Amino acid sequence: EFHGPSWCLTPADRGLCRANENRFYYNSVIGKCRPFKYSGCGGNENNFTSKQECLRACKKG
């Protein structure tokens, strides 16, 4: 059904810069966006800052 992009089901990038942030990662198992300590610079393009945007993007309802 979906084309299958390459940045919504990728593993949460957490290993590059050195900053203890808090981005919302979309879990492909439960579907809910679980916040994770994002390193910072470098990583995939799925680093959300809120939860309403994470669901409105990969879920789109």
Query: Which CATH number fits the domain that encloses residue 41?
Result: 4.10.410.10
Q: Which residues pair with 24 in a beta bridge?
A: 35, 48
Structural method: NMR
State the burial class of residue 17 (Cβ atoms within 10 Å of its Cβ: 0-12, 13-18, 19+).
Answer: exposed
User: Of 55, 15, 54, which is closest to residue 38 (Cα–Cα)?
Assistant: 15
C-alpha distances (whole Å) from 38 to each of 1, 22, 43, 47, 60 are 31, 6, 9, 8, 23
The residue segments making up the domain with residue 6 are 1-61
Question: Up-side HSE of residue 58: CA atoms within 13 Å toward CB?
Answer: 23
Instruction: Determine the straight-line distance between the first and last CA of the chain, rounded to whole angstroms.
Output: 16
Radius of gyration of the chain (CA): 11
The vertex-5 CA angle with 51 and 52, nearest 5°, equals: 10
Say how many domains are in the chain.
Answer: 1
